[PDB]
Short mmCIF file of C-alpha atoms in Angstrom, two decimals:
data_model
loop_
_atom_site.label_atom_id
_atom_site.label_comp_id
_atom_site.label_asym_id
_atom_site.label_seq_id
_atom_site.Cartn_x
_atom_site.Cartn_y
_atom_site.Cartn_z
CA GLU A 15 -21.47 -6.48 4.44
CA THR A 16 -22.36 -4.97 1.11
CA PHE A 17 -20.64 -2.60 -1.32
CA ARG A 18 -22.96 0.19 -0.10
CA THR A 19 -21.87 -0.23 3.53
CA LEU A 20 -18.25 -0.79 2.41
CA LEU A 21 -18.05 2.42 0.42
CA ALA A 22 -19.52 4.18 3.39
CA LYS A 23 -16.52 2.86 5.40
CA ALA A 24 -14.14 3.72 2.58
CA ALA A 25 -15.25 7.36 2.88
CA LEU A 26 -13.68 7.47 6.40
CA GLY A 27 -10.31 6.47 4.97
CA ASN A 28 -9.48 4.48 8.14
CA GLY A 29 -9.45 0.97 6.79
CA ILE A 30 -5.68 0.58 7.16
CA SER A 31 -4.81 -1.50 10.18
CA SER A 32 -2.19 -0.44 12.65
CA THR A 33 1.36 -1.55 12.00
CA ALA A 34 4.10 -2.33 14.56
CA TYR A 35 6.33 0.28 12.87
CA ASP A 36 4.02 3.22 13.07
CA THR A 37 2.83 2.16 16.53
CA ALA A 38 6.46 1.80 17.73
CA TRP A 39 7.12 5.41 16.59
CA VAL A 40 4.18 6.72 18.63
CA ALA A 41 5.57 4.81 21.56
CA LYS A 42 8.77 6.96 21.51
CA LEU A 43 6.79 10.06 22.53
CA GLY A 44 6.64 9.16 26.27
CA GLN A 45 8.37 12.29 27.52
CA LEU A 46 6.03 14.41 25.37
CA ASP A 47 2.75 12.60 26.21
CA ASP A 48 2.80 9.98 28.90
CA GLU A 49 -0.64 8.38 28.29
CA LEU A 50 -0.19 8.49 24.51
CA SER A 51 3.04 6.46 24.42
CA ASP A 52 1.80 4.06 27.11
CA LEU A 53 -1.13 3.03 24.93
CA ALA A 54 1.21 2.49 21.93
CA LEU A 55 3.60 0.49 24.14
CA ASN A 56 0.78 -1.77 25.27
CA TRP A 57 -0.18 -2.31 21.62
CA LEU A 58 3.47 -3.39 21.01
CA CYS A 59 3.46 -5.77 23.98
CA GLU A 60 0.18 -7.32 22.78
CA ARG A 61 1.39 -7.65 19.16
CA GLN A 62 4.93 -9.03 19.65
CA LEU A 63 5.36 -12.05 17.44
CA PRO A 64 6.07 -15.49 18.86
CA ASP A 65 9.72 -15.37 17.62
CA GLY A 66 10.30 -12.14 19.54
CA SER A 67 10.09 -9.84 16.48
CA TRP A 68 7.52 -7.25 15.54
CA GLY A 69 5.85 -6.87 12.17
CA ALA A 70 3.57 -9.00 10.05
CA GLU A 71 3.12 -12.46 11.44
CA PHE A 72 2.56 -13.65 7.85
CA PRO A 73 4.00 -13.13 5.28
CA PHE A 74 7.60 -13.02 6.49
CA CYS A 75 9.46 -9.97 5.13
CA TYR A 76 12.99 -9.27 6.25
CA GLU A 77 12.66 -5.50 5.86
CA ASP A 78 9.25 -5.56 7.57
CA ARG A 79 10.60 -7.54 10.53
CA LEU A 80 13.81 -5.61 10.83
CA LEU A 81 12.36 -2.09 10.85
CA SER A 82 9.41 -3.06 13.10
CA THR A 83 11.66 -4.78 15.58
CA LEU A 84 14.22 -2.01 15.58
CA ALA A 85 11.57 0.66 16.06
CA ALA A 86 9.80 -1.34 18.79
CA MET A 87 12.95 -2.32 20.64
CA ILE A 88 14.10 1.31 20.63
CA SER A 89 10.80 2.63 21.94
CA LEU A 90 10.64 0.02 24.69
CA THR A 91 14.26 0.67 25.76
CA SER A 92 14.06 4.44 25.59
CA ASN A 93 10.91 4.41 27.76
CA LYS A 94 11.41 5.18 31.45
CA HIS A 95 9.37 2.14 32.33
CA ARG A 96 11.47 -0.38 30.38
CA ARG A 97 11.82 -2.49 33.52
CA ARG A 98 8.17 -3.52 33.21
CA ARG A 99 8.76 -4.78 29.73
CA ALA A 100 12.07 -6.63 30.26
CA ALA A 101 10.58 -9.97 29.06
CA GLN A 102 9.66 -8.36 25.73
CA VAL A 103 13.07 -6.72 25.29
CA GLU A 104 15.04 -9.88 26.05
CA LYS A 105 12.87 -11.85 23.64
CA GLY A 106 13.23 -9.03 21.15
CA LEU A 107 17.03 -8.96 21.53
CA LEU A 108 17.23 -12.59 20.43
CA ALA A 109 15.00 -11.98 17.42
CA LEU A 110 16.89 -8.74 16.61
CA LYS A 111 20.25 -10.44 16.69
CA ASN A 112 19.02 -13.26 14.47
CA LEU A 113 17.79 -10.65 11.99
CA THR A 114 21.02 -8.66 11.96
CA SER A 115 23.13 -11.86 11.88
CA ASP A 116 15.07 -2.19 -0.70
CA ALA A 117 11.82 -4.25 -0.82
CA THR A 118 9.96 -1.70 1.31
CA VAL A 119 9.73 2.14 1.11
CA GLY A 120 12.65 4.04 2.52
CA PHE A 121 14.36 0.85 3.80
CA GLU A 122 17.84 1.77 2.66
CA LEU A 123 17.46 5.28 4.13
CA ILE A 124 15.67 4.41 7.41
CA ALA A 125 17.40 1.11 8.50
CA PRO A 126 20.83 2.76 9.08
CA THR A 127 19.32 5.33 11.46
CA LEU A 128 17.49 2.68 13.48
CA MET A 129 20.59 0.41 13.43
CA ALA A 130 22.69 3.26 14.90
CA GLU A 131 20.03 4.16 17.45
CA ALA A 132 19.63 0.55 18.58
CA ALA A 133 23.42 0.38 19.02
CA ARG A 134 23.41 3.55 21.11
CA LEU A 135 20.94 1.82 23.47
CA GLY A 136 23.11 -1.30 23.57
CA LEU A 137 20.55 -3.35 21.68
CA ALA A 138 22.50 -4.32 18.58
CA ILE A 139 25.88 -4.56 16.95
CA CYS A 140 26.73 -1.93 14.34
CA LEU A 141 27.53 -5.75 5.39
CA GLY A 142 26.19 -2.62 7.02
CA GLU A 143 26.79 -0.67 3.82
CA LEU A 144 23.47 1.09 3.89
CA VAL A 145 25.29 3.89 5.78
CA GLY A 146 27.06 4.95 2.53
CA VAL A 147 24.00 4.22 0.37
CA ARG A 148 22.10 6.66 2.51
CA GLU A 149 24.80 9.34 2.17
CA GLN A 150 24.81 8.94 -1.69
CA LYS A 151 21.04 9.27 -2.08
CA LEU A 152 20.74 12.18 0.37
CA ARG A 153 23.40 14.13 -1.61
CA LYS A 154 20.99 14.14 -4.59
CA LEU A 155 18.94 16.74 -2.66
CA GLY A 156 21.51 19.16 -4.03
CA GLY A 157 21.53 21.31 -0.90
CA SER A 158 17.75 21.48 -0.86
CA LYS A 159 15.73 20.39 2.17
CA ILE A 160 12.92 17.92 2.67
CA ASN A 161 9.40 19.36 2.69
CA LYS A 162 5.77 18.46 1.83
CA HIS A 163 6.38 18.31 -1.95
CA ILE A 164 9.04 15.59 -1.78
CA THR A 165 8.11 11.94 -1.46
CA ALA A 166 11.00 11.47 0.96
CA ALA A 167 8.98 13.47 3.43
CA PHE A 168 6.90 10.27 3.92
CA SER A 169 10.14 8.78 5.28
CA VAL A 170 11.40 12.08 6.87
CA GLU A 171 12.56 10.06 9.89
CA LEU A 172 15.46 8.87 7.68
CA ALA A 173 17.12 12.15 8.68
CA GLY A 174 17.56 10.61 12.13
CA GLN A 175 18.22 12.39 15.35
CA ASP A 176 21.12 14.39 13.90
CA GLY A 177 19.68 15.09 10.45
CA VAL A 178 17.20 17.93 11.28
CA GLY A 179 19.43 20.51 9.53
CA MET A 180 18.40 19.20 6.08
CA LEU A 181 14.61 19.52 6.72
CA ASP A 182 12.37 22.47 6.03
CA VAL A 183 11.17 22.64 9.65
CA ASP A 184 8.10 24.80 8.82
CA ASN A 185 7.26 23.15 5.49
CA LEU A 186 6.67 19.52 6.50
CA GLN A 187 3.33 19.64 8.37
CA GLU A 188 0.07 19.49 6.42
CA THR A 189 -3.45 20.71 7.19
CA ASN A 190 -4.16 18.00 9.78
CA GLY A 191 -0.86 18.58 11.61
CA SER A 192 0.69 15.43 10.07
CA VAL A 193 3.83 14.98 8.04
CA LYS A 194 2.57 13.27 4.87
CA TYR A 195 -0.24 11.50 6.78
CA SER A 196 2.31 9.10 8.23
CA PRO A 197 1.96 8.49 12.00
CA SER A 198 5.64 7.46 12.11
CA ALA A 199 6.81 10.54 10.20
CA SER A 200 4.64 12.73 12.50
CA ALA A 201 6.03 11.09 15.67
CA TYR A 202 9.56 11.59 14.46
CA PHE A 203 8.69 15.27 13.65
CA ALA A 204 7.03 15.88 17.05
CA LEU A 205 10.09 14.33 18.77
CA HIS A 206 13.24 15.64 17.05
CA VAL A 207 12.22 18.42 14.63
CA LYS A 208 9.63 20.49 16.58
CA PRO A 209 9.72 18.84 20.01
CA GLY A 210 6.28 18.77 21.64
CA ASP A 211 4.56 20.24 18.55
CA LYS A 212 0.92 20.34 19.58
CA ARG A 213 -0.45 19.80 16.07
CA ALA A 214 1.70 16.79 15.25
CA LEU A 215 0.87 15.33 18.63
CA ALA A 216 -2.84 16.15 18.18
CA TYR A 217 -2.79 14.40 14.83
CA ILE A 218 -1.26 11.26 16.38
CA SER A 219 -3.42 11.52 19.53
CA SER A 220 -6.59 11.45 17.46
CA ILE A 221 -5.57 8.20 15.72
CA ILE A 222 -4.68 6.51 19.04
CA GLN A 223 -7.88 7.67 20.68
CA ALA A 224 -10.02 6.58 17.73
CA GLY A 225 -8.32 3.21 17.10
CA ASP A 226 -7.13 0.24 19.04
CA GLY A 227 -4.02 1.93 20.50
CA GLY A 228 -1.89 1.47 17.38
CA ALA A 229 -1.21 3.53 14.31
CA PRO A 230 -1.66 2.72 10.60
CA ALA A 231 0.63 3.28 7.68
CA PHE A 232 -1.44 6.18 6.31
CA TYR A 233 -4.24 8.28 7.67
CA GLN A 234 -6.57 9.17 6.28
CA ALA A 235 -6.71 7.63 2.79
CA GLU A 236 -10.34 7.95 1.66
CA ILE A 237 -9.58 8.42 -2.01
CA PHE A 238 -7.38 5.35 -2.13
CA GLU A 239 -10.04 3.27 -0.37
CA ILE A 240 -12.98 4.65 -2.39
CA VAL A 241 -11.17 4.31 -5.71
CA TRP A 242 -10.02 0.74 -4.98
CA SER A 243 -13.37 -0.30 -3.55
CA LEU A 244 -15.14 0.99 -6.65
CA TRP A 245 -12.57 -0.68 -8.90
CA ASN A 246 -13.30 -4.10 -7.33
CA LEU A 247 -17.04 -3.45 -7.49
CA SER A 248 -16.76 -2.71 -11.26
CA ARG A 249 -15.42 -6.29 -11.72
CA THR A 250 -18.85 -7.75 -11.01
CA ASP A 251 -21.74 -7.89 -13.53
CA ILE A 252 -23.16 -4.51 -12.59
CA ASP A 253 -24.26 -1.88 -15.10
CA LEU A 254 -22.43 1.24 -13.91
CA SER A 255 -24.17 3.35 -16.60
CA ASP A 256 -27.46 2.62 -14.83
CA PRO A 257 -28.71 5.94 -13.19
CA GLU A 258 -29.57 4.28 -9.91
CA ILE A 259 -26.07 2.74 -9.64
CA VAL A 260 -24.51 6.13 -10.51
CA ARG A 261 -26.67 7.73 -7.82
CA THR A 262 -26.03 5.07 -5.21
CA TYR A 263 -22.26 5.61 -5.53
CA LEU A 264 -22.58 9.28 -6.65
CA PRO A 265 -21.31 10.81 -3.38
CA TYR A 266 -18.03 8.89 -3.69
CA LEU A 267 -17.51 9.68 -7.37
CA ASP A 268 -18.13 13.30 -6.45
CA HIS A 269 -15.58 13.19 -3.65
CA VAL A 270 -12.89 11.88 -6.04
CA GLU A 271 -13.82 14.34 -8.76
CA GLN A 272 -14.00 17.33 -6.35
CA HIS A 273 -10.39 16.71 -5.22
CA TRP A 274 -9.26 15.91 -8.84
CA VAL A 275 -6.84 18.49 -10.13
CA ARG A 276 -7.17 18.57 -13.96
CA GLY A 277 -3.91 17.86 -15.62
CA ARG A 278 -2.54 16.38 -12.35
CA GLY A 279 -4.98 13.95 -10.76
CA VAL A 280 -5.56 12.77 -7.20
CA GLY A 281 -3.77 11.67 -4.05
CA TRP A 282 -4.75 9.27 -1.29
CA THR A 283 -6.67 11.90 0.67
CA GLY A 284 -8.48 15.02 -0.38
CA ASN A 285 -5.95 17.51 1.13
CA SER A 286 -2.92 15.58 -0.24
CA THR A 287 -0.15 17.80 -1.55
CA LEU A 288 1.01 15.30 -4.11
CA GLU A 289 -0.87 13.45 -6.88
CA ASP A 290 0.32 10.03 -7.96
CA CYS A 291 -0.22 8.13 -11.21
CA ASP A 292 -1.26 4.93 -9.33
CA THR A 293 -4.31 6.54 -7.67
CA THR A 294 -4.96 8.80 -10.67
CA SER A 295 -4.93 5.95 -13.21
CA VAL A 296 -7.31 3.72 -11.21
CA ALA A 297 -9.50 6.73 -10.43
CA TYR A 298 -9.64 7.54 -14.12
CA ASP A 299 -10.59 3.95 -14.92
CA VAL A 300 -13.30 3.95 -12.25
CA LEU A 301 -14.78 7.40 -13.03
CA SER A 302 -15.05 6.58 -16.77
CA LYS A 303 -16.84 3.28 -16.23
CA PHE A 304 -19.32 5.14 -14.01
CA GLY A 305 -20.23 7.46 -16.91
CA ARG A 306 -17.96 10.32 -15.92
CA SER A 307 -15.69 12.04 -18.43
CA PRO A 308 -12.48 12.39 -16.42
CA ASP A 309 -9.29 14.08 -17.56
CA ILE A 310 -6.75 11.68 -19.10
CA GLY A 311 -4.13 14.42 -19.03
CA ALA A 312 -3.74 13.70 -15.37
CA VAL A 313 -2.37 10.29 -16.27
CA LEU A 314 -0.15 11.45 -19.19
CA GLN A 315 1.70 14.02 -17.13
CA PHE A 316 3.39 11.00 -15.44
CA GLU A 317 4.62 9.57 -18.74
CA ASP A 318 8.37 9.14 -19.14
CA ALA A 319 10.68 7.80 -21.79
CA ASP A 320 10.32 4.06 -21.03
CA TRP A 321 7.45 3.87 -18.52
CA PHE A 322 4.96 5.87 -16.50
CA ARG A 323 6.21 7.37 -13.23
CA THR A 324 4.40 6.89 -9.92
CA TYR A 325 5.33 10.43 -8.75
CA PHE A 326 5.86 13.38 -11.02
CA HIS A 327 9.43 14.20 -9.86
CA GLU A 328 10.56 10.62 -9.24
CA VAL A 329 12.12 8.34 -11.81
CA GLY A 330 11.83 4.78 -10.46
CA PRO A 331 9.08 2.72 -12.12
CA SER A 332 6.48 0.30 -10.86
CA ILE A 333 4.73 -2.60 -12.56
CA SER A 334 1.13 -2.11 -11.23
CA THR A 335 1.36 1.70 -11.70
CA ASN A 336 1.95 0.87 -15.40
CA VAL A 337 -0.67 -1.86 -15.32
CA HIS A 338 -3.12 0.73 -13.87
CA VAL A 339 -2.08 3.11 -16.67
CA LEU A 340 -2.72 0.32 -19.24
CA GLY A 341 -6.18 0.00 -17.73
CA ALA A 342 -6.71 3.70 -17.88
CA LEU A 343 -5.56 3.75 -21.49
CA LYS A 344 -7.87 0.93 -22.48
CA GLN A 345 -10.77 2.66 -20.74
CA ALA A 346 -9.84 5.93 -22.48
CA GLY A 347 -10.25 4.16 -25.83
CA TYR A 348 -6.60 3.73 -26.82
CA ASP A 349 -5.64 1.53 -29.75
CA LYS A 350 -3.61 -1.65 -29.23
CA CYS A 351 -1.05 -0.19 -31.64
CA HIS A 352 -0.70 3.15 -29.86
CA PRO A 353 2.85 4.16 -28.79
CA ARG A 354 1.65 4.64 -25.22
CA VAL A 355 0.03 1.20 -25.12
CA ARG A 356 3.11 -0.44 -26.71
CA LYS A 357 5.57 1.38 -24.38
CA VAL A 358 3.61 0.24 -21.33
CA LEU A 359 3.53 -3.42 -22.64
CA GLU A 360 7.24 -3.29 -23.43
CA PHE A 361 7.92 -2.17 -19.85
CA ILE A 362 5.68 -4.87 -18.45
CA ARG A 363 7.01 -7.72 -20.63
CA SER A 364 10.66 -6.87 -20.00
CA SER A 365 10.09 -6.83 -16.24
CA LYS A 366 8.31 -10.16 -15.98
CA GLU A 367 9.76 -12.59 -13.45
CA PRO A 368 11.89 -15.21 -15.20
CA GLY A 369 10.31 -18.60 -15.68
CA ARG A 370 7.03 -17.59 -14.06
CA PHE A 371 4.21 -15.72 -15.79
CA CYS A 372 3.81 -13.37 -12.86
CA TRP A 373 4.87 -9.85 -11.76
CA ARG A 374 6.16 -8.48 -8.49
CA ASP A 375 5.24 -4.87 -8.18
CA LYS A 376 6.81 -3.63 -4.83
CA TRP A 377 3.63 -1.71 -4.00
CA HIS A 378 1.98 -5.02 -3.26
CA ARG A 379 3.88 -8.17 -2.21
CA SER A 380 1.65 -10.63 -4.00
CA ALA A 381 2.31 -11.47 -7.63
CA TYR A 382 -1.44 -12.32 -7.87
CA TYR A 383 -2.42 -8.72 -7.36
CA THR A 384 -0.34 -7.51 -10.31
CA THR A 385 -0.87 -10.59 -12.51
CA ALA A 386 -4.66 -10.56 -12.00
CA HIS A 387 -4.91 -6.85 -12.76
CA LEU A 388 -2.62 -7.20 -15.76
CA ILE A 389 -4.97 -9.79 -17.24
CA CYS A 390 -7.87 -7.35 -16.86
CA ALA A 391 -5.81 -4.48 -18.19
CA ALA A 392 -4.22 -6.19 -21.20
CA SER A 393 -7.43 -7.61 -22.74
CA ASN A 394 -7.64 -6.72 -26.43
CA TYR A 395 -4.00 -5.55 -26.23
CA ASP A 396 -1.93 -8.71 -25.66
CA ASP A 397 -4.24 -11.73 -25.27
CA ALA A 398 -1.21 -14.00 -25.69
CA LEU A 399 0.30 -12.53 -22.51
CA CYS A 400 -3.02 -12.92 -20.71
CA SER A 401 -3.36 -16.57 -21.66
CA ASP A 402 0.03 -17.30 -20.23
CA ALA A 403 -0.78 -15.36 -17.04
CA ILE A 404 -4.01 -17.37 -16.70
CA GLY A 405 -2.04 -20.57 -17.19
CA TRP A 406 0.17 -19.64 -14.29
CA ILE A 407 -2.87 -18.85 -12.09
CA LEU A 408 -4.52 -22.14 -12.95
CA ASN A 409 -1.29 -24.07 -12.44
CA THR A 410 -0.66 -22.62 -9.00
CA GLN A 411 -4.19 -23.22 -7.62
CA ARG A 412 -4.08 -25.17 -4.38
CA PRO A 413 -5.87 -28.47 -3.73
CA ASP A 414 -8.60 -26.74 -1.71
CA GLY A 415 -9.22 -24.21 -4.43
CA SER A 416 -7.25 -21.35 -2.91
CA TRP A 417 -4.20 -19.32 -3.94
CA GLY A 418 -1.17 -18.03 -2.02
CA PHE A 419 2.21 -16.61 -3.00
CA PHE A 420 4.18 -16.94 0.25
CA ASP A 421 5.44 -19.66 2.61
CA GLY A 422 2.87 -22.14 1.34
CA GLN A 423 -0.18 -20.42 2.84
CA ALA A 424 -3.39 -19.21 1.19
CA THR A 425 -4.89 -15.75 1.49
CA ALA A 426 -8.45 -14.56 0.97
CA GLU A 427 -7.15 -11.48 -0.78
CA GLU A 428 -4.90 -13.37 -3.21
CA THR A 429 -7.65 -15.83 -3.91
CA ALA A 430 -10.09 -12.94 -4.63
CA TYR A 431 -7.70 -11.44 -7.17
CA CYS A 432 -7.37 -14.81 -8.98
CA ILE A 433 -11.12 -15.15 -9.10
CA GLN A 434 -11.42 -11.68 -10.57
CA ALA A 435 -8.81 -12.59 -13.29
CA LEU A 436 -10.35 -15.99 -14.08
CA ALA A 437 -13.85 -14.57 -14.31
CA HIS A 438 -12.61 -11.74 -16.54
CA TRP A 439 -10.80 -14.13 -18.89
CA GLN A 440 -13.89 -16.30 -19.10
CA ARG A 441 -16.00 -13.43 -20.26
CA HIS A 442 -13.32 -12.20 -22.69
CA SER A 443 -12.23 -15.49 -24.31
CA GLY A 444 -15.20 -17.72 -23.78
CA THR A 445 -12.91 -20.28 -22.04
CA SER A 446 -14.98 -22.14 -19.40
CA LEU A 447 -13.27 -21.57 -16.03
CA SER A 448 -16.40 -22.07 -13.86
CA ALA A 449 -14.97 -25.16 -12.25
CA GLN A 450 -11.93 -23.33 -10.86
CA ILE A 451 -13.95 -20.28 -9.86
CA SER A 452 -16.46 -22.50 -8.06
CA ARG A 453 -13.71 -24.30 -6.07
CA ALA A 454 -12.09 -21.01 -5.15
CA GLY A 455 -15.44 -19.57 -4.09
CA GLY A 456 -16.05 -22.62 -1.89
CA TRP A 457 -12.77 -21.99 -0.03
CA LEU A 458 -13.16 -18.19 -0.05
CA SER A 459 -16.54 -18.18 1.65
CA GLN A 460 -15.07 -20.18 4.53
CA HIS A 461 -11.95 -18.00 4.98
CA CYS A 462 -13.16 -14.41 4.14
CA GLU A 463 -13.22 -13.10 7.63
CA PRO A 464 -10.56 -10.74 9.04
CA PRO A 465 -7.86 -10.31 10.21
CA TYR A 466 -6.21 -10.24 6.75
CA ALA A 467 -2.53 -10.64 5.90
CA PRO A 468 -0.83 -7.32 5.30
CA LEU A 469 0.30 -7.62 1.68
CA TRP A 470 0.53 -3.90 0.84
CA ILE A 471 3.92 -2.24 0.93
CA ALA A 472 4.62 1.09 2.68
CA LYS A 473 7.69 1.55 4.88
CA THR A 474 6.54 -1.80 6.32
CA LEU A 475 3.72 -4.19 5.35
CA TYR A 476 0.16 -3.02 5.88
CA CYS A 477 -3.42 -4.02 5.18
CA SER A 478 -6.36 -1.88 4.07
CA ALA A 479 -9.25 -4.04 5.36
CA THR A 480 -11.74 -1.89 3.35
CA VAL A 481 -9.96 -2.65 0.07
CA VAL A 482 -9.52 -6.34 0.86
CA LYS A 483 -13.20 -6.68 1.75
CA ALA A 484 -14.10 -5.00 -1.54
CA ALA A 485 -11.92 -7.51 -3.38
CA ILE A 486 -13.57 -10.39 -1.52
CA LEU A 487 -17.13 -9.23 -2.06
CA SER A 488 -16.31 -8.65 -5.73
CA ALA A 489 -14.81 -12.19 -5.96
CA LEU A 490 -17.72 -13.75 -4.04
CA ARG A 491 -20.30 -12.14 -6.37
CA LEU A 492 -18.33 -13.27 -9.40
CA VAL A 493 -18.49 -16.84 -8.02
CA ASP A 494 -22.29 -16.57 -7.80
CA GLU A 495 -22.38 -15.31 -11.42
CA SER A 496 -20.73 -18.55 -12.52
CA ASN A 497 -23.13 -20.59 -10.31
#
């Protein structure tokens, strides 16, 4: 595996592994497509966790386990063949009860609808106050309906079986027949909004036919995977101003630029209705280092009073979105004294975890993702903060050289991010960190093979293998650079 072959894969935008949650939703379509749901049900039966739950085996995440188990248990029980899967249901009932007796996307709005549906099937009972929380947040639609231009459409299934009235029925589906490129949102749509919709089903059918029987969090996502794969590449000692390097990765830079709307930016896939600051800030960073002259106005349109927004019309902030912006601002040539640089740092500083020198972003579960990228982003802006962040990375390194932020287990992805940050600091400060990079590289080269832990946050946890591989290759080559 090389960056050349990895960017080729990134262009497909299919590096995101299937999730139990999106697969469970496909499994509820049995009365619409018999073969389709049966494949998804088999995926669920193969991927049920040893404790009876569905979701990521590691790391444990209550929201991830609850929504995946609720969705899976509902699909198994609604299916006309439930008697063949009684052993999975009984095991899931015990796990589901143990679970029931805002970390993920749409959790507060989706959980109450799956809790109610599970109860209707006799799977669960009912601090179930998310019912009122959902009412409150929905009322902020102001009588408007959900459609393609609202981030909630990614979680459109929060409407539930009896919420179709508040959806723009003919304004949810996109060019590929999907609702916001979410297999779960599309399965919901094809089941309760436009029952048997051929295009929503065709969208889902293509994923199940092409993949392993399951469904990923997002599909496709070629801009996200290209932009993040190039970002990790740029961490290595490679001259991106070299014409051959520009021409080797030219087709991917062109793809991002071609779908770049000036003044607005880019989404996860070319046809995406909505641009986001997270993708746009990293894409800006990447394009500029490759010798392009991209449009910084596409980042600034997300600027708000106290932080940068992730979505234009949303208010809630994110750490890494603002860390990405800080990177985009540094690459754009901003001064360390600039009000935009200072406002971003003020946001980051005031949202640091207490005691630790780390950040939890809620777009990625690992503090090493955000902390490592903060170190790279804040260089020449707040080197005091970066020194403290490095100190935390060095202090939390495991005896075998690896890093991990959950349940006492290491991850190749988290180790790769720490290597990137250590190598960056070494170049910037002159501090010799070769001993720690060397130990990490020794461990990383023995544990760099998939499957990878799903540390990315959507409605549940997911993994983009293409991006993680890019992070690992980048880290492995950085190790070689330090001998």
